[PDB]
Amino acid sequence: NRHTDTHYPSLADKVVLISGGASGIGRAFVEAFVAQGSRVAFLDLDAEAGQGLAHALGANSLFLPCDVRDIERLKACVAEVERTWGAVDVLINNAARDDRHALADVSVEYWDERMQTNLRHAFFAAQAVAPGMARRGSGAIINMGSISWMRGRPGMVCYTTAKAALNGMTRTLARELGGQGIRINSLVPGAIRTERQDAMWAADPAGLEAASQAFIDQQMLKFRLDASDCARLALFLASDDSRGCTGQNFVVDAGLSIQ
Amino acid sequence: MNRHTDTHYPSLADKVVLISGGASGIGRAFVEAFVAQGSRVAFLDLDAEAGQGLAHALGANSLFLPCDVRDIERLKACVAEVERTWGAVDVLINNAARDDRHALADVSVEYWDERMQTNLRHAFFAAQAVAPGMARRGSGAIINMGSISWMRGRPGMVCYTTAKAALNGMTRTLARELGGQGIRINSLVPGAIRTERQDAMWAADPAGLEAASQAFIDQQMLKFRLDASDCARLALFLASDDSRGCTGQNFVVDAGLSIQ
Amino acid sequence: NRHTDTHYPSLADKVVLISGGASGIGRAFVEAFVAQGSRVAFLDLDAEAGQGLAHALGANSLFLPCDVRDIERLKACVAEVERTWGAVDVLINNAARDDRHALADVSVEYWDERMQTNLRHAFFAAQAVAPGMARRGSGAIINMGSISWMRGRPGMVCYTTAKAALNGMTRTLARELGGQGIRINSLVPGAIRTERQDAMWAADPAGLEAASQAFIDQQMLKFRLDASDCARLALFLASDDSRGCTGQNFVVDAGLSIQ
Amino acid sequence: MNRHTDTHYPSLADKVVLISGGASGIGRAFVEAFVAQGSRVAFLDLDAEAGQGLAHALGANSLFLPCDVRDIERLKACVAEVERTWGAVDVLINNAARDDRHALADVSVEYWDERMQTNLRHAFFAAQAVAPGMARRGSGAIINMGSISWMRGRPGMVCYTTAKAALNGMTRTLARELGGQGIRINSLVPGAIRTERQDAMWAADPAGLEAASQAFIDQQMLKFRLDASDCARLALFLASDDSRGCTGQNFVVDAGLSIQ
């Protein structure tokens, strides 16, 4: 799975590090950059899925097991990529947990855990890759955002608050690191069809279909987005074709955020 | 006692207002302004001597609670006590924050966690605490203090600016989550506010203070310095019935500094 | 009709100039500022309605007939207010025409006419009031905006494009005039119930009610906004309580723009 | 012939692209970049000698039409001619504009009207002209050239910045109006782009040019000057199938100058 027929020569050999890379959207990033000839390291909690995917993709892929709550382990993972391949060229902060939770019912421990799996690792990963980027004079960071806080969507307050945090963090880190040659942008998907979003309804295909159609009806473009649409955008945001873009959101949502 | 405005909002009289970080700077100006409108104002602060001092000045319609907002249990205890004394909160202002500077490369996990606790976490928990009483009544208002710093991509204080950007999003989603219960939530987003605390920080460099002040004036569209009263004027409006149809929105009081 | 029980001493005696002031939202502005003790001049195409309203409100109101397409006449109207009462303190650019029109069917003459009635007069009114404001060292301008272009609403492309134009014009005029002491903001309503929005369905009360309920269902707050909600916000944006606010949008829409 | 990128978009081959203000500066870079991808590129310009010159360089997959975009009849005639030659437009880029400076107090009605005609009106009429052919096919893309100038509240060019803000809104509403017919509309929003035309304007003040250039670099987050190729890189992406799910959106290429 190439995800596109477009060919970016500027991606060849680049070292790309993707958190949450073994399944879903992060898997599509891993696949797309490997297809462009990048050297792609990815982290995931699921060791069996990660190992499977790196074995399938071969030697220009590198899977490291990592719980992104564990910042020591995250830094260990970054140092290991650096020792294997040199400074990271492209970091994609993608790891997230989007489970539904009622506002009235969130405990302090729940809040902490969700901020940690959704927001904290993205700061520490940027902090880890930065010195290597600055030594070279170039690098790019892509924070996965979400239109859900833009549209004020209820029922997952920690996830949407974390994603809004990353919106801010892109803008300030863009200024703080830009003088070192690092560009930082957010890739902000709409409602992406995934095997996991679909697994949730395995005995209500009426319900799945109805919910899918509702997104199509609300969207401006009348087809379902998928992980390839996200990977198309990530390739552009990593390539030299976006060398002067920083501090910005790039939204791939078929119009769902403008209703 | 300082009024902050000559405007009179009859809709503010008797309302129960709760302001975190209320004993100094901006939060102090909110406490003063609502007391002057005849509200029943409870406020939280770490500084007990400052808190006790401010409540001494303002008298019996003010109520000072010692609270470390990092302690969520104590935050909820503070809210429960206000409720038992005065009835459901009408107006919550999430104002407590810590804006110390810190280079990205210097931030440890411990520091990050502590700043998220002081800057962001309490604001959710306070809204969570006041909401059920507001919903029982059918009405209420929440003001999250935001900041133009993340909009302007300001460097060198990543934990503060990231917490502030977080609250921008939390305003929008809680506005949907609670609107059907009659609660409106908006963010009050100040520019560069002159305070005695920001000014105490240069007490041996008057040249430097004045230079920095003028730099704000030159960057701003309006050529005077904003102060705490400007923030309090806006807060009275966001709490009053004059803003009853407004929710999920930023209201920015910054003399144009965010548009340069 | 006071529109509020709030009392702004800083509005007393201020000279307020409102375009489209004889009916609908602009009428509510005229009423609210007269109640605060302002000296309120207003312009409208409807001379009979304008004369009626100024006669009812008495001597601190002043109605001038004006077709806002006619910029000569607009400037004449401004000069006359200035000669009567002195420099304008508060300008509200409110005149607009929001009729529904299909994209596919707009002619060049239609486009021109709609840009002229929706956008052009707001620039020329600001330009007319500015020198008087600057002489004094203070003044405020409120451009009526609209959430319709934010929500990408179709079927009235000239109206929504004009309102988006005014969004920009607020920001740039705020910088260009701010050094003279003039603050410029946009007041951006959501779906405001008016006698005119309602007159459109005088034999389909089912249809009116259904459409009203649809706004309530989409809104975050579950009640209909009306012209008083807009006038409450205008009073604040004109008063000294907003002296340091400029360049900004203030949206009064019950959450309709965030869905 | 200048490629602007080494990237290869097979989805651009044979597509029919139509660019207003195409014979100089940025629009010239778009014309060049799409020709290099194997598109069939028609472009409009007032400057016939410049247009004829550029089409001479680029050869038979380019097509130069003399057009004053103030003449809506001629604009529609230009579109009809492309359609009869090559089939429905796949990609429209609304790029023609005039960015001359003008103090607010200096603007006459005649000037305002003329600048709205040159900066905004044609963009609507071009989208209107290309839309039915795009809808018959089921697909198409529109790029409105926007500007960070109104976002940054830049003074002294009110007609230009107001027209640009207009196009920001027109992107969002046309995206809803046409999306169901398979057409996506987005705005490409450049920062301070170095061009031979912006540079010709200082040919006797090299100090002044360099000073102004460095001021952009100091204000930007990225410390190099953007050029027309940066805009063209972004346009290829917004026209290609790689952006097929993107619509109603701004894509800003400005090295951070809009966030200060």
Numbering used by the authors:
A (entry chain A), C (entry chain A): 2 to 260
B (entry chain B), D (entry chain B): 1 to 260
Task: Provide the authors' original text about this structure.
The sulfosugar sulfoquinovose (SQ) is catabolized through the sulfoglycolytic Entner-Doudoroff pathway, beginning with the oxidation of SQ to sulfogluconolactone by SQ dehydrogenase. PpSQDH is a tetrameric enzyme belonging to the short-chain dehydrogenase/reductase (SDR) superfamily with a strong preference for NAD+ over NADP+. Kinetic analysis revealed a rapid equilibrium ordered mechanism in which the NAD+ cofactor is the first substrate to bind, and NADH is the last product to dissociate. Structural studies revealed a homotetrameric structure in solution and crystals, involving cross-subunit interactions in which the C-terminus residue (Gln260) inserts into the diagonally opposite subunit to form part of the second shell of residues lining the active site.
To elucidate the enzyme-substrate interactions of PpSQDH, 3D X-ray crystal structures of apo-PpSQDH as well as binary complexes of PpSQDH•NAD+ and PpSQDH•SQ were obtained to resolutions of 1.7, 1.9 and 1.9 Å, respectively, each in the I2 space group with two molecules in the asymmetric unit. PpSQDH adopts the classical SDR fold with a highly conserved active site architecture comprising the Asn119-Ser147-Tyr160-Lys164 catalytic tetrad. We observe an ordered region with a higher B-factor (residues 195–218) in the crystal structure of ligand-free PpSQDH close to the C-terminal end, which corresponds to the extensively documented substrate-binding loop of SDR dehydrogenases.
